[PDB]
Amino acid sequence: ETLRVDPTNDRLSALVEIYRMMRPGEPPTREAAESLFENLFFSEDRYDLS
Amino acid sequence: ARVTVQDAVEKIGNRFDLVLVAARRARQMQVGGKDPLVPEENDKTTVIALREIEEGLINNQILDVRERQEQQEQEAAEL
Amino acid sequence: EEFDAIKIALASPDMIRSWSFGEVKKPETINYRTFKPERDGLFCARIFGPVKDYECLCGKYKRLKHRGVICEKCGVEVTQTKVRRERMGHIELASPTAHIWFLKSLPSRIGLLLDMPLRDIERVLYFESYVVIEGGMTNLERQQILTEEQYLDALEEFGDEFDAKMGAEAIQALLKSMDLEQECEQLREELNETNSETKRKKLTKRIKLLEAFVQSGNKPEWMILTVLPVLPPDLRPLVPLDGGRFATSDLNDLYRRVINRNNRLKRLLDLAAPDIIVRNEKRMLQEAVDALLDNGRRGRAITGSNKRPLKSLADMIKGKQGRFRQNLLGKRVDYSGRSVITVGPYLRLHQCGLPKKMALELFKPFIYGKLELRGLATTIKAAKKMVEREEAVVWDILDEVIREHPVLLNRAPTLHRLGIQAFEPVLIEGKAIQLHPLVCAAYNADFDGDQMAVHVPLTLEAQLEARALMMSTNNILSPANGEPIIVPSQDVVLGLYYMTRDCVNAKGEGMVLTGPKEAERLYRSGLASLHARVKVRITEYEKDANGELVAKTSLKDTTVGRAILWMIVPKGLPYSIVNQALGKKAISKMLNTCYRILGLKPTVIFADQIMYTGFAYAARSGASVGIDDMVIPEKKHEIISEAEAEVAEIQEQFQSGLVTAGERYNKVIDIWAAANDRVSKAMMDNLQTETVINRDGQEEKQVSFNSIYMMADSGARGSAAQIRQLAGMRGLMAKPDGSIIETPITANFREGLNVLQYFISTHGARKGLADTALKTANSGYLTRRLVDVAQDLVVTEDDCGTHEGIMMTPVIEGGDVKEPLRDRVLGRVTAEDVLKPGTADILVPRNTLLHEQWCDLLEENSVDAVKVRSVVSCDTDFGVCAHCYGRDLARGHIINKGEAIGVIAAQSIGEPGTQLTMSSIQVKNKGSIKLSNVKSVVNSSGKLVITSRNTELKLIDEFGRTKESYKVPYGAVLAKGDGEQVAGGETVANWDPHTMPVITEVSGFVRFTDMIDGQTITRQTDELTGLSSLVVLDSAERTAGGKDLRPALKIVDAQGNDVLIPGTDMPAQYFLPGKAIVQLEDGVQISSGDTLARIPQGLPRVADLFEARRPKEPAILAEISGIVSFGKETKGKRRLVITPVDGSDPYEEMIPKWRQLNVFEGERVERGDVISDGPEAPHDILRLRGVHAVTRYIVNEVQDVYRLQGVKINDKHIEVIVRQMLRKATIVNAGSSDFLEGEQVEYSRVKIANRELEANGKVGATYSRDLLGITKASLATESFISAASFQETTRVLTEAAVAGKRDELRGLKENVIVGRLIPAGTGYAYHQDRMRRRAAG
Amino acid sequence: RTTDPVRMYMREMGTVELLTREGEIDIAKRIEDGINQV
């Protein structure tokens, strides 16, 4: 259901719209959203479980 | 009398008008310095004002008559 | 000083030029060291004013040699000061930025007008997109946006002949363009072309804004800012501290902010920049402007290093925090004090303990005038010296002042007018205030850590108001009810109870007296019992004659205490009232009789002595209570073990798998509660009457010796429940879930808890305590809104000359009397001449004071209904007659004019609500029966079954005034009829409480017609027996081939006709819905009254009740009389083909037929007839019904909510607010003014009292009547200030200003905060004098 | 619905780019030449 509801054909568009919703505007580049996502939950800097 | 406000009201009929007439009559006597008509009995001006009201001796009408007449005689004394 | 009225308006720019004194030019204010107001900064004295007297800054001009000589060097004034709180400077702007309140708030007021979307305008004004100022060519259009890149296309195409920019410049121009009149007549015109609803209201809206700007003369371009004020420093100050440490306001930042930006604006504008930076800069500017008006409105707020927002200008007006609720309506006060408190048992009424220093320092200038008068202190320095010297004379002098000088007593929270009082002073050598304890009952107070505050009546007016009005002798009852509020609280009751007491036991039995004096001598000699029935003589008195006592005397065998007690009694009474043990209710009614009969002062002084003697002979009476006064029965362990071996029975039953948990659960709790009850009964029989004391006999038993029962019997404290908890089990316990615990308690505090028992005891204790910690918030909130509504209302007139109002009938229903119509009437006044069951025995000429002689005279009569001139039926514009109100209770006579009323009901209603949140029909006795509004039938039993749901049962007495009353369902079964007599205790009615009967009143054959298996229905023949019929399914389950086809088995005869409804040609057959399953097949016949089928199955409440809150689930009703069929087939909702008899059919509305219907697809209704089932809404009632029905419904509802809790208030109060909800009526017709618009029903009645008078047969319009939610009803007000004080203020203020409106200070709230006198009561006379001055010029 | 003009202005300046090393000195030339002709 949700998959059909999910229009991002590709991972790339997913990156774009992630970046977009998070950074509303139109500056898109790749490394921005890439490092963004990676820093959310996959960098030691901005995230830790205890 | 002192603690109770009964027959002073039964004379007039309304608490509001009663304290208005009281607080006029006893400003004529607080600051002015005119004379009582009921005896004194060592109380402040409030009780004696209420006493003068009870026995039908001070009223809005009666104050009106007295001050009217006196001020008119003073107007005559001017000329 | 004196002024007539107020006004709001739109300040022109030149208006501000007029207001201002100099323009401001820099962000600086002072030096670092010479903490000095700088020129042209913030605090420049040159424009705002000087510090000292006649001192220019450099001291050039001085000492009036140079009087009006502005020191040219510093440009500084010379003359007098105190204008740094007055003078406002100003600033001229570079360019226009906008005001925001006329932009951001709901309906936008600015683009609202322009018929344009907001976001479009944002795109303009965040400087994102250009837009047509004006299409020079009509190729393009005004109100048309051009992106700054498409604008290029529009541009390079033409360049010349268009006007399109991006900013207030683009927009003031637009405002500066647009002409109002043509637009207005155009909307007026083309409304009549197409005045559909949303369209019509929108056109009306814009026409209103138009003609408002027309006739106001206020202007559209004034929205926008080109000059800006600046405040005096003293509202925005900066000061140092003793540490040299400085302290400022928020706003001095923000002013400062803008300066530099405007400087960096203009500074840049010297320098020819790209527009982009200018846009950015302007953004910064208007952002700062928003921040001034509201830090946190449009977006993310602004802070310093506080990390906290800077306080808005608006925040100064706001919440409580602004002027209204903090600083203006509540105030700090001079000449007041406070202290811890205590009791004076000895005291009398007017007296009050007073630690003397309090009055000492509080009565100082009396004393200083007095010492100058004596000249011991010739003047006041020496007076204070001698004060420090502590001369005895002072105290005499102090006493010599204090005599007859009344004083004010103050506790909080103040829930009603009686929570403060006015006494006479009494001095004492302590620091704890002694008082007359009973009035704790008024204050709800207790000597457990309470404390209180005090105020002074300096002026004679206050002095005398105190002595006359909230003198306690003038205040003894509630206005809520005729209740003595000085119930003897806790001890006096008990000592007296113990005294008036009839043992047999003590001694001295069967002797005789002369009178109670020797009774004293005799007991006091030590001969006798103060509790012993023995003979004496009395001499009691009666005023049977013309208010004239009538003496007599005879003997009585009575207890000694009572004889003694007669000595107190003032000689107008029998002995019968004092002839008993006198529970405290007896005391209540006893004092009641005293003022009933004699009046006040006997009852007063009587009561004081009763207090005194209660203390005396209770402190004599001897008393304590201990471990052995607490007593346990023995018949507890055995009931315990018995039910213990039965809980184990059902335990093993569930082990085998028989019963459920819920069955098990309910039955276990039933047996445990029964065991509790049995334990209570055992201890009651074992403690109440157990004692065996002989007295001239073998054994004798009377009032107990346990020491516990008569604590409850006196009413002092406690009841059977608490005592049970000490002795027996203390009921059950709950975790805060709301569930109920299974294993109850066994021990008590005499025996001692388990670990677990107390562990569990924890829970609901915490819960209900939390609730106790929060119901006051809602309480204060609500009561605050209540006063917020009804501030306007005061009596004006003796008699409004009005036509009739309400009817009164008792509320007895379902049980015995719940409100005697006697109790309803008393002190009201008739609507109408009123005769007796002896016909034509009129006794009112339409209005008398309905005092208790009249009420007794009635209660004789079998009359059971009467009308009364209603507050609503009163018609006094802007107030009332006193007749439609009648009596002030705690006065105890007719209400005099001038006293305000709405506040009174508010205190009446708000105060108590703090305490407040926490089959068959069987005839009882004999009596007449009264059923009506009836269609029914001799059923197939021969007895009676309803065929008009309207009807319900009553047991009327043999006379004609009711006993009992109970609902009766449509077609339920009876064993009786109306107009008969029946024995008591007799199941007269019965029915299946599951069935809603489909009974056929007709007699006619059955044949399967209109209905076929699996088209409209299913066929489900009962597997067990075999008989059935065509089985109707629900809305969904049936097949769609006949789901649009109404299934109806049809009543026929041997021929096939329609058995028409008996008496009307209407056919009789049933368009059967779901669950209307018939059991007998084709060819079968039914009886009259024969089911073809059956139909098998607090605080926030009241908050919603008064709020005008409204449900979602109406038991929807008949809009109009006449027959109905059903409608469209459920595109979300079915519709409803209505058909009046003579009216018009087409009305029909979306129905969720998912929920059950009342009337069927071929069945007729009268208007005012429910159609679905559920709750319903008030607006439906007004919209259809009269009023009396309505108001009567709601008063019954909520009074029950009260009385549920055992709560007592007169209905009159609740009438009052009704008329304040009803201050607006929507118009029907037109010709006077705009068509439909809600407006003062009062002023409607004015204009028609001018215009539809022979001014015109008619020009104006008829009108509906409306209703409002209470807070918004408060908002909808002629004045705005009462509206502006508290809630949704900003919006009200804007809407007030747009029309340049004004006010006249008629509500009291209006005249308070200005310092004027009240428009009522005391100042009624003054303010009506002022009124006729306004009448006399 | 981004009202933050940070986003606006940074977008609006991200519009433009830079050029180097002779368009620079060409602009200098143009400037000084028009100035010499004033």
Ligand SMILES: [Mg+2]
């Ligand atoms: Mg307390």
Ligand SMILES: [Zn+2]
């Ligand atoms: Zn100077």
Ligand SMILES: [Zn+2]
């Ligand atoms: Zn009236």
